[PDB]
Amino acid sequence: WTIGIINRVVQLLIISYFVGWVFLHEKAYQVRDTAIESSVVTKVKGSGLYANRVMDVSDYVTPPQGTSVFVIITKMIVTENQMQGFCPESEEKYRCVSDSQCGPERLPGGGILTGRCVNYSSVLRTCEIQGWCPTEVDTVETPIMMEAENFTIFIKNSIRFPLFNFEKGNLLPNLTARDMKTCRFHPDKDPFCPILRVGDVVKFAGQDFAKLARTGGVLGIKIGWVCDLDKAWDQCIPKYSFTRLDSVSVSPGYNFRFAKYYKMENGSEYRTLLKAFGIRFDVLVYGNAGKFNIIPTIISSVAAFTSVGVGTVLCDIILLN
Amino acid sequence: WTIGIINRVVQLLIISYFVGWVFLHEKAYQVRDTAIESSVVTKVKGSGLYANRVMDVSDYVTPPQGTSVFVIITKMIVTENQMQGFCPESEEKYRCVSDSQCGPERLPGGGILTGRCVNYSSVLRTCEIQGWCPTEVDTVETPIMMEAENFTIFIKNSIRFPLFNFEKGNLLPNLTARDMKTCRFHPDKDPFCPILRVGDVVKFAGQDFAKLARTGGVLGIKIGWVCDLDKAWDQCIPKYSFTRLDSVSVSPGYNFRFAKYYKMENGSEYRTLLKAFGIRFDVLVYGNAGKFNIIPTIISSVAAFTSVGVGTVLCDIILLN
Amino acid sequence: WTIGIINRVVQLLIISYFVGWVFLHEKAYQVRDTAIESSVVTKVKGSGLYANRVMDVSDYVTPPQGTSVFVIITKMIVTENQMQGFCPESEEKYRCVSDSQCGPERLPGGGILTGRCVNYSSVLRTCEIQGWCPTEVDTVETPIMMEAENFTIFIKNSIRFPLFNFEKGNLLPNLTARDMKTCRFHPDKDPFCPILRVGDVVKFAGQDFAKLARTGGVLGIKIGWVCDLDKAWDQCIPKYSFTRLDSVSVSPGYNFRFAKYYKMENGSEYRTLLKAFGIRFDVLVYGNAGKFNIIPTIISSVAAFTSVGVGTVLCDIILLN
Ligand SMILES: *[C@@H]1O[C@H](CO)[C@@H](O)[C@H](O)[C@H]1NC(C)=O
Ligand SMILES: *[C@@H]1O[C@H](CO)[C@@H](O)[C@H](O)[C@H]1NC(C)=O
Ligand SMILES: *[C@@H]1O[C@H](CO)[C@@H](O)[C@H](O)[C@H]1NC(C)=O
Ligand SMILES: *[C@@H]1O[C@H](CO)[C@@H](O)[C@H](O)[C@H]1NC(C)=O
Ligand SMILES: *[C@@H]1O[C@H](CO)[C@@H](O)[C@H](O)[C@H]1NC(C)=O
Ligand SMILES: *[C@@H]1O[C@H](CO)[C@@H](O)[C@H](O)[C@H]1NC(C)=O
Ligand SMILES: *[C@@H]1O[C@H](CO)[C@@H](O)[C@H](O)[C@H]1NC(C)=O
Ligand SMILES: *[C@@H]1O[C@H](CO)[C@@H](O)[C@H](O)[C@H]1NC(C)=O
Ligand SMILES: *[C@@H]1O[C@H](CO)[C@@H](O)[C@H](O)[C@H]1NC(C)=O
Ligand SMILES: [Mg+2]
Ligand SMILES: [Mg+2]
Ligand SMILES: [Mg+2]
Ligand code: NA
Numbered sequence: 015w016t017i018g019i020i021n022r023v024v025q026l027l028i029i030s031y032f033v034g035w036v037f038l039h040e041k042a043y044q045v046r047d048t049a050i051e052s053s054v055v056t057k058v059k060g061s062g063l064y065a066n067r068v069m070d071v072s073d074y075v076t077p078p079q080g081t082s083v084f085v086i087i088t089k090m091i092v093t094e095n096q097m098q099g100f101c102p103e104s105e106e107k108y109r110c111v112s113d114s115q116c117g118p119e120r121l122p123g124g125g126i127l128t129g130r131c132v133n134y135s136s137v138l139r140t141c142e143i144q145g146w147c148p149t150e151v152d153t154v155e156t157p158i159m160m161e162a163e164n165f166t167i168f169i170k171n172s173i174r175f176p177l178f179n180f181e182k183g184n185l186l187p188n189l190t191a192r193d194m195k196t197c198r199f200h201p202d203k204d205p206f207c208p209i210l211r212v213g214d215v216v217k218f219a220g221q222d223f224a225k226l227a228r229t230g231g232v233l234g235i236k237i238g239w240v241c242d243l244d245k246a247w248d249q250c251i252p253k254y255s256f257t258r259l260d261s262v263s264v265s266p267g268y269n270f271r272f273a274k275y276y277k278m279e280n281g282s283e284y285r286t287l288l289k290a291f292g293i294r295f296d297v298l299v300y301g302n303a304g305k306f307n308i309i310p311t312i313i314s315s316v317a318a319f320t321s322v323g324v325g326t327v328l329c330d331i332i333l334l335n
Numbered sequence: 336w337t338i339g340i341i342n343r344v345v346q347l348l349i350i351s352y353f354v355g356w357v358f359l360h361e362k363a364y365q366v367r368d369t370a371i372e373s374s375v376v377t378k379v380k381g382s383g384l385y386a387n388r389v390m391d392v393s394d395y396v397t398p399p400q401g402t403s404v405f406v407i408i409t410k411m412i413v414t415e416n417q418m419q420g421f422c423p424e425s426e427e428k429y430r431c432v433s434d435s436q437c438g439p440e441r442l443p444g445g446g447i448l449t450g451r452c453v454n455y456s457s458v459l460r461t462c463e464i465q466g467w468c469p470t471e472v473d474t475v476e477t478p479i480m481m482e483a484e485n486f487t488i489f490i491k492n493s494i495r496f497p498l499f500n501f502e503k504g505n506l507l508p509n510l511t512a513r514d515m516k517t518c519r520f521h522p523d524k525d526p527f528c529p530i531l532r533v534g535d536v537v538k539f540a541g542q543d544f545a546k547l548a549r550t551g552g553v554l555g556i557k558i559g560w561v562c563d564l565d566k567a568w569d570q571c572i573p574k575y576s577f578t579r580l581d582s583v584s585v586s587p588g589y590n591f592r593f594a595k596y597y598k599m600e601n602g603s604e605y606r607t608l609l610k611a612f613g614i615r616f617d618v619l620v621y622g623n624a625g626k627f628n629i630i631p632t633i634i635s636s637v638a639a640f641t642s643v644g645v646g647t648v649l650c651d652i653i654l655l656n
Numbered sequence: 657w658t659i660g661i662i663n664r665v666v667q668l669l670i671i672s673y674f675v676g677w678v679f680l681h682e683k684a685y686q687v688r689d690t691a692i693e694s695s696v697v698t699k700v701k702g703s704g705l706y707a708n709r710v711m712d713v714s715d716y717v718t719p720p721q722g723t724s725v726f727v728i729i730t731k732m733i734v735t736e737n738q739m740q741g742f743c744p745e746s747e748e749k750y751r752c753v754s755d756s757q758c759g760p761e762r763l764p765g766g767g768i769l770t771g772r773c774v775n776y777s778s779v780l781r782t783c784e785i786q787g788w789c790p791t792e793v794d795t796v797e798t799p800i801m802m803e804a805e806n807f808t809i810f811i812k813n814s815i816r817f818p819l820f821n822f823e824k825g826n827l828l829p830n831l832t833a834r835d836m837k838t839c840r841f842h843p844d845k846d847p848f849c850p851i852l853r854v855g856d857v858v859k860f861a862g863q864d865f866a867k868l869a870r871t872g873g874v875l876g877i878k879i880g881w882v883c884d885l886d887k888a889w890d891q892c893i894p895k896y897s898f899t900r901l902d903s904v905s906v907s908p909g910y911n912f913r914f915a916k917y918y919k920m921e922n923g924s925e926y927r928t929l930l931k932a933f934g935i936r937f938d939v940l941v942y943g944n945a946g947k948f949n950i951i952p953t954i955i956s957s958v959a960a961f962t963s964v965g966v967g968t969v970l971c972d973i974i975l976l977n
């Protein structure tokens with residue numbers, strides 16, 4: 015009967031179209047390179063006021079070289095002119111009543127205890143320690159540098175998909191509405207401008223610059239290079255997204271200590287101890303490109319051939335019911 | 336004959352079970368994301384004694400920002416109050432008998448030779464050089480900071496599988512036996528506590544803190560995120576492993592030089608030159624997640640269908656022999 | 657007819673050979689790990705002359721720890737003995753005629769403007785600013801450190817393919833023609849020596865050390881670990897390639913600012929502001945290993961079986977035409 019091949023032809027038309035669109039949708043004919051090879055060069059610009067001092071890029075950006083992880087210091091605590099010696103720790107956790115509870119068995123991971131119980135102040139009595147004196151008082155409140163909200167982060171990114179040796183940069187003058195020197199990234203108006211406003215990044219990440227600058231934090235500028243290397247070079251394009259990575263028992267925020275080391279004409283040494291709070295920026299470059307390949311195209315082919323060949327049989331069985 | 340289909344049915348039962356368990360074992364129905372996207376924030380805590388000085392996190396940890404690669408300095412060599420000028424190098428490799436073997440052709444990659452053969456000491460005669468004087472004597476023996484064994488490394492890690500957009504952190508309060516503030520990672524008792532004892536990491540890596548602190552070294556804290564994103568969020572879990580990466584013609588260990596730069600009231604410049612030996616820690620985050628996908632499930636399906644269809648034929652041929 | 661099976665046997669011989677060589681060529685029987693896990697330790701050696709000063713590794717290499725991204729400073733601009741205060745900016749872009757165009761609305765991202773229009777010099781009138789005074793004059797010409805061309809970069813690299821747990825290092829004494837201590841990487845004579853001459857790297861990247869040292873730049877030392885883990889351990893070998901990553905509206909080159917902070921006996925603070933130009937080196941380790949697997953071998957098998965089975969039918973149809 016001729017209707018049998020019009021039923022079979024329809025079987026193949028319909029079934030083969032479902033299978034066809036699915037495999038064509040997932041790019042099953044493409045080999046994929048998910049090991050992007052990226053280089054990130056960052057540049058911060060701006061000047062702020064902290065206390066009655068002005069902070070420039072040499073003062074608040076650390077490290078200075080422009081790596082993929084850098085910190086913009088927004089608030090700090092200074093303990094000036096420390097010197098090696100003996101003094102009573104100011105932390106309440108070091109409370110003592112007598113030298114019998116200032117032995118090495120107490121607070122093993124903390125500072126070096128001399129073994130004497132001394133009077134830090136008239137209201138507290140703490141174990142004495144050997145180290146930089148006086149000790150740090152990290153329980154005071156200090157201001158934050160508000161001008162940092164208007165600083166700009168410039169991200170030059172040069173990536174390469176090695177499986178295909180397809181290397182490209184994220185400086186694209188034609189994709190940007192305004193000139194490179196004056197543009198400013200906006201997810202909608204200018205999504206390819208490499209210059210980001212610090213406050214903007216804080217908003218795209220859903221964060222309040224006040225609380226964030228107060229407690230410090232870790233934000234991620236995510237650069238995604240999802241590319242179809244079957245298409246034009248023009249089509250491999252970076253997409254920027256933003257997220258807070260520290261999120262959240264542990265106290266949120268981000269801070270670290272470093273000192274400025276000075277030496278007296280006498281030769282004695284003394285430092286300024288600095289506890290820094292800021293916003294660490296991690297440039298996270300993901301990417302995966304897909305190029306047509308004979309092997310995945312043959313495997314996907316064989317897969318779709320056999321699957322339709324069985325679907326037509328099963329559909330014949332379902333119809334005859 | 337009915338036995339022919341009981342032989343064929345057994346063929347399909349047995350053969351299909353082998354193929355089935357194999358493919359089900361390798362998760363052949365799963366697409367895999369092997370391009371994890373991780374952020375690492377580290378925090379070191381502790382205080383040590385070196386010579387008659389106390390070292391805190393601002394003194395022995397470098398860099399300070401808490402990156403994925405940091406160094407805990409255990410032994411150092413100081414050459415204090417250097418100043419630009421001329422002086423005889425102390426390295427024996429620079430031995431000379433006359434100014435005729437102190438020309439630019441000699442030791443091309445070394446320091447800047449003035450061209451004079453001078454008497455460093457009464458027992459050695461070396462080429463004179465222009466640079467920081469006096470020169471460094473890196474052949475002496477110095478102590479090591481033993482308290483560093485009791486320092487703790489706290490690793491906060493926030494990763495994301497971008498192919499699935501599955502982001503998670505390694506701070507898991509319910510997986511830890513004791514509180515976050517006081518726990519301490521143990522591969523068996525508390526394998527999810529993010530706080531590591533430096534000495535412990537040295538042991539998990541099979542290293543002696545004495546020799547390691549003496550020569551310096553490079554250890555790896557490996558965080559592995561092997562996950563089945565078909566299962567619950569609760570099941571994606573990090574696993575910590577440890578290894579020594581410098582291992583091993585070349586002299587083992589790890590050291591680097593940096594200076595503390597001071598300026599005299601006169602305006603002249605002088606530095607303290609420091610050769611630092613310590614333990615560099617590299618946090619190496621690997622991860623790959625697997626999620627069910629239609630394409631790999633169809634390809635694996637077609638693969639198992641055809642393979643059993645041939646195995647039953649071959650087994651029929653083997654039986655009739 | 658017997659010729660029908662000699663035509664079919666030839667069909668299978670020919671068709672099966674094409675398919676066979678193709679699949680065998682692409683290692684379709686291999687699972688692939690493209691998430692290499694690498695550790696990089698670098699060491700720079702050399703001494704240069706800048707002005708009438710000598711720069712050693714502690715002076716021009718930053719950071720000092722030997723990370724995968726480091727900088728060799730070739731030219732710098734010093735602005736010595738700055739101090740907080742008020743002074744007229746030297747940038748022409750800050751030209752003013754009256755204090756009415758020195759308000760906060762002008763150059764929002766720049767320095768902190770006091771609101772006064774002052775005379776920087778007799779030929780220029782600029783807005784006054786609060787900050788480090790005097791201001792920087794980054795339009796002068798300064799020398800470059802030429803000895804940096806003869807510096808050597810030593811790269812120790814320790815990688816691991818985690819899917820197979822195959823870890824190896826790039827220190828291979830038998831693959832190098834000369835001893836480790838004295839060899840020098842050459843793409844042809846000694847392509848496994850880990851010691852690179854800075855000038856050499858500049859040439860492999862197609863760059864002129866003069867212009868590059870003048871403007872600074874970003875070069876990549878690419879380490880590739882393409883390996884067949886079916887073969888001997890001896891066969892997994894690193895291959896070094898080189899490229900300039902900054903390439904290229906934006907001014908090329910690479911520079912960053914950092915200060916040396918001094919304090920007077922009076923207690924007042926003053927710094928030396930340094931704009932550094934150099935060559936940043938990014939060690940980029942790519943790698944992917946292939947090991948035989950049952951699943952990819954079965955899938956590729958099924959793929960080739962079905963494809964030949966159809967090719968013989970299509971070829972029969974083409975012949976009978
Ligand atoms: C580490 O701390 C314990 C106390 O918890 C102490 O007994 C031990 O001596 C310390 N280790 C070193 C090397 O000082
Ligand atoms: C950049 O603009 C020019 C025209 O000004 C255009 O020809 C060029 O193709 C653009 N860049 C790309 C990748 O197309
Ligand atoms: C050096 O002088 C200062 C006072 O200027 C003094 O406090 C310090 O103890 C002296 N150093 C020594 C080792 O005496
Ligand atoms: C590099 O060293 C060689 C000696 O090995 C010397 O002749 C040459 O001038 C040096 N290059 C520079 C740029 O100084
Ligand atoms: C953490 O503990 C709470 C109960 O205290 C539990 O409900 C929660 O599910 C735990 N975390 C996870 C991922 O289950
Ligand atoms: C500055 O003074 C010191 C002694 O305090 C002296 O050694 C040095 O040479 C002087 N600098 C100059 C340029 O004379
Ligand atoms: C940012 O700059 C604008 C001028 O462009 C200014 O009005 C605004 O106050 C600045 N923001 C902060 C937080 O100072
Ligand atoms: C290094 O050289 C020795 C012989 O001196 C040789 O036996 C060894 O196999 C070489 N290394 C490798 C990976 O073969
Ligand atoms: C400290 O002394 C210097 C001169 O040596 C002077 O210029 C400076 O203004 C003084 N500091 C203060 C707060 O007066
Ligand atoms: Mg404290
Ligand atoms: Mg020496
Ligand atoms: Mg300027
Ligand atoms: Na298949």
